[PDB]
Design a protein around this nucleic acid. Structure first.
Ligand SMILES: [K+]
Ligand SMILES: [K+]
Ligand SMILES: [K+]
Ligand SMILES: [K+]
Ligand SMILES: [K+]
Ligand SMILES: [K+]
Ligand SMILES: [K+]
Ligand SMILES: [K+]
Ligand SMILES: [K+]
Ligand SMILES: [K+]
Ligand SMILES: [Mg+2]
Ligand SMILES: [Mg+2]
Ligand SMILES: [Mg+2]
Ligand SMILES: [Mg+2]
Ligand SMILES: [Mg+2]
Ligand SMILES: [Mg+2]
Ligand SMILES: [Mg+2]
Ligand SMILES: [Mg+2]
Ligand SMILES: [Mg+2]
Ligand SMILES: [Mg+2]
Ligand SMILES: [Mg+2]
Ligand SMILES: [Mg+2]
Ligand SMILES: [Mg+2]
Ligand SMILES: [Mg+2]
Ligand SMILES: [Mg+2]
Ligand SMILES: [Mg+2]
Ligand SMILES: [Mg+2]
Ligand SMILES: [Mg+2]
Ligand SMILES: [Mg+2]
Ligand SMILES: [Mg+2]
Ligand SMILES: [Mg+2]
Ligand SMILES: [Mg+2]
Ligand SMILES: [Mg+2]
Ligand SMILES: [Mg+2]
Ligand SMILES: [Mg+2]
Ligand SMILES: [Mg+2]
Ligand SMILES: [Mg+2]
Ligand SMILES: [Mg+2]
Ligand SMILES: [Mg+2]
Ligand SMILES: [Mg+2]
Ligand SMILES: [Mg+2]
Ligand SMILES: [Mg+2]
Ligand SMILES: [Mg+2]
Ligand SMILES: [Mg+2]
Ligand SMILES: [Mg+2]
Ligand SMILES: [Mg+2]
Ligand SMILES: [Mg+2]
Ligand SMILES: [Mg+2]
Ligand SMILES: [Mg+2]
Ligand SMILES: [Mg+2]
Ligand SMILES: [Mg+2]
Ligand SMILES: [Mg+2]
Ligand SMILES: [Mg+2]
Ligand SMILES: [Mg+2]
Ligand SMILES: [Mg+2]
Ligand SMILES: [Mg+2]
Ligand SMILES: [Mg+2]
Ligand SMILES: [Mg+2]
Ligand SMILES: [Mg+2]
Ligand SMILES: [Mg+2]
Ligand SMILES: [Mg+2]
Ligand SMILES: [Mg+2]
Ligand SMILES: [Mg+2]
Length: 51
RNA sequence: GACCGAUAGUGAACCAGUACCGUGAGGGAAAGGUGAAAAGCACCCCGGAAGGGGAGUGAAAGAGAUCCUGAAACCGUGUGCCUACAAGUAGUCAGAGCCCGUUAACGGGUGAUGGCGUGCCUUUUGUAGAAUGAACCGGCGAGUUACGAUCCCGUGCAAGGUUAAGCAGAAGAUGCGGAGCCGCAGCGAAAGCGAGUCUGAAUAGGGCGCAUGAGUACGUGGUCGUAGACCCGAAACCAGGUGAUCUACCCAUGUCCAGGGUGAAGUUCAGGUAACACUGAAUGGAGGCCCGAACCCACGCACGUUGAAAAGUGCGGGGAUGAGGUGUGGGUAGGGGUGAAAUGCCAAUCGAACCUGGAGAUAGCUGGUUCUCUCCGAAAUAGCUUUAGGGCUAGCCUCAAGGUAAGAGUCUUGGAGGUAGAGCACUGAUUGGACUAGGGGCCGGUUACCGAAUUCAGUCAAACUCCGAAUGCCAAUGACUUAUCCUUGGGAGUCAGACUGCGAGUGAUAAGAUCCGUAGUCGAAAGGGAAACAGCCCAGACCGCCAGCUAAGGUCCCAAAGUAUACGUUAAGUGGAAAAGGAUGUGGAGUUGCUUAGACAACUGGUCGAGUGACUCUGCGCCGAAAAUGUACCGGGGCUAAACGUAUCACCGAAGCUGCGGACUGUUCGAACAGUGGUAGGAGAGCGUUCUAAGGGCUGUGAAGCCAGACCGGAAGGACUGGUGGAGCGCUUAGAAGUGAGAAUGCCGGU
RNA sequence: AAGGAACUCGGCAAAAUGACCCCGUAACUUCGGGAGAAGGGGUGCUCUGUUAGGGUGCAAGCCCGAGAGAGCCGCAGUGAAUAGGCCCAGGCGACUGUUUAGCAAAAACACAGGUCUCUGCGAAGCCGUAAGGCGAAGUAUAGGGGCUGACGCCUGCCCGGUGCUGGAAGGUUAAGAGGAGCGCUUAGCGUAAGCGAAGGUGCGAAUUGAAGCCCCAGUAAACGGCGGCCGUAACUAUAACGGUCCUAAGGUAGCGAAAUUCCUUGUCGGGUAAGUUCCGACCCGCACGAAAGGCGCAACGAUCUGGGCACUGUCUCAACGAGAGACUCGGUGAAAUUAUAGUACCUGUGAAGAUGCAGGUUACCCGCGACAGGACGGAAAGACCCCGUGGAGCUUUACUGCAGCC
RNA sequence: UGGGGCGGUCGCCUCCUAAAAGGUAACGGAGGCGCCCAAAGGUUCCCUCAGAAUGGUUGGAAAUCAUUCGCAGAGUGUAAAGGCACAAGGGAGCUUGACUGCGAGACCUACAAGUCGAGCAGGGACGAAAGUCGGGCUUAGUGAUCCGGUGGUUCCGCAUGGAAGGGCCAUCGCUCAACGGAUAAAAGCUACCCCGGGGAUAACAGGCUUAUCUCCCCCAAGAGUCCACAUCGACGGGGAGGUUUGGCACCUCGAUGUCGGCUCAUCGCAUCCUGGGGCUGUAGUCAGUCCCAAGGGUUGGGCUGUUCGCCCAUUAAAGCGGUACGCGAGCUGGGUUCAGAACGUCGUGAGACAGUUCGGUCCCUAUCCGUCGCGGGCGCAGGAAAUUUGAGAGGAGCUGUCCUUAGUACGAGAGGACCGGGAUGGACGCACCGCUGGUGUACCAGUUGUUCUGCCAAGGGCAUCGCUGGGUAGCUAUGUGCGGACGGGAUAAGUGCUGAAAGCAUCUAAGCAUGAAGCCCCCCUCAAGAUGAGAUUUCCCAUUCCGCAAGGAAGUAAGAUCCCUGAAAGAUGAUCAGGUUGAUAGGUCUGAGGUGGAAGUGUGGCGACACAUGGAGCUGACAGAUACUAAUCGAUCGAGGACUUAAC
RNA sequence: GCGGGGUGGAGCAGUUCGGUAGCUCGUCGGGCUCAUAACCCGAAGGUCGCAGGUUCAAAUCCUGCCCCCGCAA
């Protein structure tokens, strides 16, 4: 009696860890989320050589 | 004093802040009554005494010291009826026999036997429930009060109504007191304007108002707000204190450890060396050393487990000169201390001690909430919700006041719509044939090699439609019938629903499953049937009757009524449990092959001598058919009808309906008609308890209380008589409430 | 009796061992131990005997006292009571010690030893608001804190992240200093519109202004971390070797199916007739690893684990006996529980598991000694699960704060 | 929220579910939206689309033309539905009505909101005019309040004038997307845990269902040398059971204790063994499959907590299930899920498991029914003492090996029977103590320590009965004897005989047999409360009172009890042997069995000790005898026999 | 069913935000050497897994389809 409930209670604890990790990560990003630094564009043009 | 009267009122009426409980702060009871007067039972008898039986005192001793009254539980004694073949929610209805004789009544007690019948409460869709609560009896124990708001009702005055504090006065009535409050005027955010005003450019429209008018003061009642706010109940939080006489650690000063063993360093001697080293003996007496009592500890097992003991005993076990045991006196205190660290320990309490206070913390949760009858009578739904077992608005109920006839049923007529069915005209899916562009595999020419598209026929669709109902829905006009309906306001409860039939989804076209639509019953519905069986069938209990007719369902016995009538079927106890499938079971229709030119069968083409084969539909049966305590799907007996089908007629059968009698409610005009189940809940009318006022009484020639009884009223309830009791108590009208108990693992007492 | 662990989760419990003397005693070792290892033998009484010898004493005489020989008795001589069972092997902890008073004594805590770090003395650290204290009447060979835990051999790589330490300029930043300016107000100017001094007043920018942070180095017995893919050797198979990607760096020694191995009762060897346990190896380490230390390890342990011997009522399989209860009599006399009970069985029905309902079956009335199938028995308003916009303890880069510190 | 969690969802639009008005749920089936357009809006005017065939330079299936056919097969910004070809689809001219104030009246609706709207006024666009225009073919494209920003303003301005500040109108700021929005501001652990509730809600067992599971079938492609159906049974189809995995959430949260084991069983049959049969690809021995059959039986160990499973060794066999996965007020407590601790792993962490490991309190005196035993009462038409019948109930029910038949039948051999006789075991049961043993606490003996009887000798107490060696009665198994034997009756499956219906055939319809360890008996035990109270033999005898009777009372008869001595009986009652003309118990005497040579004395020895007297002495329960002691005297209870009929 | 990958021969970027297809090694050809390696000089090798859309332009954005790898299975 209560076999699966016991094991499923354990499962629910693992879920709570995921939810907490998620929530904290989201909150941390909102507090401090550096944007990716500018990737300077590269001008490219070549005077193709003639014969 | 419309305050209490010994469980009340102070905790304390009494030698009570006592007894008792706690180390302490602190907590904290129980317990009143002789008589007018002790006149408190001289004397005698039984007894060791207690306790009795007389005799005396007294109005009374059945007033004799827990001494007014003396209920119930509970415990006994005697006996009028019944009881040892009986299956019991304990009664109720019927009923002999026996025994009595009353509030004199179509009486009382008991009860062989027959019928019927699973407590009360709470909580539930649903409880006899094996869900909850109560051992029993008694007492106590829960919507109250203050101040505001609003509505109804009553009264006074009325376009007005009314005073508050305060001052005089019986703690009163009343007089004075007009400040203030509400209303008569509204509109606008406001300036402001005013029967109008605001918006707007507007004499427009529209909103809110006016014309269509009643308020106010006080009282009663309903509800609401703020207060503990109907009563009981947390785990907790915070504040101030009390604890280290237990236990943790520390500090100071004491004290305890029977006996035995092992033999460290060092030292000495002897040997040894050039010297040392080295070797052997002896001495020596180290150690969180060894073995083992006291003492301390607590490893295993048994026992104990309403214990001898709220942690022990018995048999073994570990340490036992050490980081040892223990005494005395001290220290550290809870947002703290102490911890060789277990969240362990800090007075049998520790993830935050104990006591008191804030405090009646809060509890959308559980439990409880006390007299009676009558009128009406739900909901378990929608929306929103840090919402889902809560709440709010609507729906559904009730009361009152208005409108009033505006409601409803049916018929007739009109209309909106795309479901069932059907259909392929579109969109998808799809079968066969034809015709086929191409596509691939073969040498640009072909394969029956994939094949687009076209066409012919043929299927199919919740999210296909050229079509398209039945019902249901919205209206209109009459007619016939019925009595509802709407507006405003007061009060609610309900938001867990259940099953059954039908139409669907989810599921597996399972579920007493789940979610909607629709109708019913239950919930909140007793009675009859289905053996028992909320939801199925029949049918709605105001009450009495030893009257009648019926419904579902029945009629051989249990058990009321047909062993009814007529015609067939079944042989399986089918009826009284299930499929695919199998089968010369049997009944009834129909078709067809052959047949006295002689069949089928059997006999060596003939003998023989009247039937013989196949198939379709259909009624009732058969096999397929094995579960666990015990026949075990007919309720039982039992049944060959007492089963099944068809038809007919009788009778039985409810609390349905009818007849007779009574009560009440409503409607219309004392009559008639109609109605009278009920949970949550609304409304009305009453009974009873305590106290007050005013009248009128009762009571020592016996009050209240208590105990009986066969009386009275529709209920709550009220009398009368007798016994006990020994001094208070009813009745009528009105008023005010500590006003009604069977349940709260309620509190206290008794048993 | 016979058997002897066949019992059982497990030799739990009991049995067996036990004193003194003599002989004898292994692996291993930290050279002390292990060790009472283990395994054996002896034990009574009598006579040689106030013994050989020893203590006391002036001596007599008192005590102590081995060893033998020679005999006697019994089933048996520490004749009773009291007094280790032992051996082999492994895991963990070194050890003695300490711990959940009252379900855990242990591998947990402590420990000596190791290391890191703080502290120059009014030390750091700690208690307190402060004074005043502990530290300490101490002074870096001392004191506090963290981690590890005797001893032996060792303790590898990574400073990118986080912490700590040290820097130097610079960037960012508060109060406080500064008050450019702007608004309001109004003497006055004006036909008005509007402008507007001074004063007052409401805002106020530049500039200035520390630590911290940013930045740069170091530090791992600081908190921590310690990888993927591809190819390659003349049988094959594996790769000493090579390529590339990523990282701060990719796990070294040692150990390994483990207190760690899910698959798994891995495979192999040993032990048994039979071994999911055990021991020895192997290494595809789900998910070892070097001071939350790695690997060994004598001694120690009421530690955990497996195997032998002894021994037995643990068992095959139960029997008998003793005492105390039970039972009868005399005395005394509770408790939990309890809606009232004249309180059967079967099948069924029902809130789906009935003493109580239905249909049958069975049953004369009342007890006593016994057993526990039922009364969903008693006890404790379930601790599991879910719910409540309940509580408390704890954690942190949750939110908001406070002390402390700079 | 078909427990919670994860996943998914949360507001709005379209369709289907939705049952032809509207509305209508589920974590039902499909999709879209959080915009876009300055023209893709308004108006005025004009206008048809897709596709196919044919003709044509590049040109190709498909670009552009041209003709014919061609209801929409197109398009309509953006999903779907409803519309649209007097277009809402395409093109062109001018413009901004994608206006301001509004708004009769309606739809929808709990509210808050949302939707439609003629018409009026102001000032405009297009148009010759009528007239149309308050965005788009229609239906999504959005967010309350509070609080801030901005613009306007015949509003207010706290003595007054200003101002500060506010109001009104317009407008902006929320993926407040959990979209009717808790605060401006918020994550976890609890195994150290606690409270209030719920069977409204998880689970076990129960109930319903039966997808799955187990078992059984239908069809028959086939496999099987041929041959579907000896055996096996593809592709499909139909059931039963309620042991499995599930679905549901109906009972239980003011408690229905768990897996495994132990003790004790009980039931079903889907039969593991034994019994009886059909078919066989059954020669014999063996087997295969199916039918009947539930009477009895159905092992001991190693490993593991285990169930299970593997293994070892047996057995005739090592059956499958139900009983709350039977059985914890019957036991155990090893596994698992309390508090401690540790490893691996995860986490910053408290801690946790996707894994392990060592240690960890099992309470209750039985009221009722039930079950096993034992009594008392009454009844059974007189009162007693014995012996009995059997309605009915319980018990028992198993089986191996060997010898013989017979090396026969059978077979090429190998091997090797049926049936019928006979012996002897295993397990199990009943009884009993003569035998073998156990026990034997009032028996006998040996012996240690100490204390006592004054000492010696001889003994007593205590030390587990001090210990040790024996042992009577009784009680006992492991010991012994015996049992399940012979068979009858009726049947099951099966085998048939005669025999029609249906000139044949046929076990069947009438009729007649056979045939199982099973059923009813036989065998053992209880049994007349069998209220239906039975039957037989024997004994006692009609009393005395009252009362009119019915009936009542009092002494007794036969007989029994109280009381007493006891055991062959026993918890107590009861039962049985006895109670003085009695051997009932004790004692006494004589024995048995048991122990094993007493004490005293003498002799031998220095002594411990040995020997003789002497199979001695001692001896609980056992046997026989014997009144020596106790069973005294007494008391109590116990019939006089109802009525009716029939036959005598 | 739920996720991750397919870029010259190997290992890897670039993909979100469209703009010449790349880095390291390797392969091939020619030198150097007696010859091989190293070294030096040139070149080839992917139209970004496949097939269609969108766009002036797609490895990159969209639609389908096929492989590889993890789990569950
Ligand atoms: K009183
Ligand atoms: K009461
Ligand atoms: K104190
Ligand atoms: K209800
Ligand atoms: K009187
Ligand atoms: K007694
Ligand atoms: K009954
Ligand atoms: K009951
Ligand atoms: K970690
Ligand atoms: K014997
Ligand atoms: Mg009082
Ligand atoms: Mg008086
Ligand atoms: Mg319920
Ligand atoms: Mg309850
Ligand atoms: Mg109760
Ligand atoms: Mg010591
Ligand atoms: Mg010791
Ligand atoms: Mg002491
Ligand atoms: Mg305590
Ligand atoms: Mg308060
Ligand atoms: Mg249809
Ligand atoms: Mg339902
Ligand atoms: Mg009811
Ligand atoms: Mg009625
Ligand atoms: Mg009639
Ligand atoms: Mg009748
Ligand atoms: Mg009637
Ligand atoms: Mg009626
Ligand atoms: Mg009251
Ligand atoms: Mg064993
Ligand atoms: Mg065993
Ligand atoms: Mg032991
Ligand atoms: Mg230790
Ligand atoms: Mg120790
Ligand atoms: Mg403890
Ligand atoms: Mg302990
Ligand atoms: Mg450590
Ligand atoms: Mg390191
Ligand atoms: Mg580690
Ligand atoms: Mg480390
Ligand atoms: Mg370590
Ligand atoms: Mg008793
Ligand atoms: Mg049922
Ligand atoms: Mg039942
Ligand atoms: Mg509860
Ligand atoms: Mg779910
Ligand atoms: Mg509709
Ligand atoms: Mg723990
Ligand atoms: Mg802990
Ligand atoms: Mg609780
Ligand atoms: Mg339920
Ligand atoms: Mg067949
Ligand atoms: Mg339900
Ligand atoms: Mg209960
Ligand atoms: Mg209980
Ligand atoms: Mg069978
Ligand atoms: Mg069980
Ligand atoms: Mg039980
Ligand atoms: Mg256990
Ligand atoms: Mg009972
Ligand atoms: Mg004998
Ligand atoms: Mg002597
Ligand atoms: Mg003594």
């Amino acid at each position: 009696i209560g076999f699966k409930e016991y094991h499923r209670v354990k499962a629910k604890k693992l879920d709570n860890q995921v939810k907490s990790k998620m929530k904290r990560l989201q909150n941390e990003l909102n507090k401090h989320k550096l944007e990716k630094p500018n990737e300077e564009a590269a001008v490219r043009f070549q005077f193709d050589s003639h014969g």
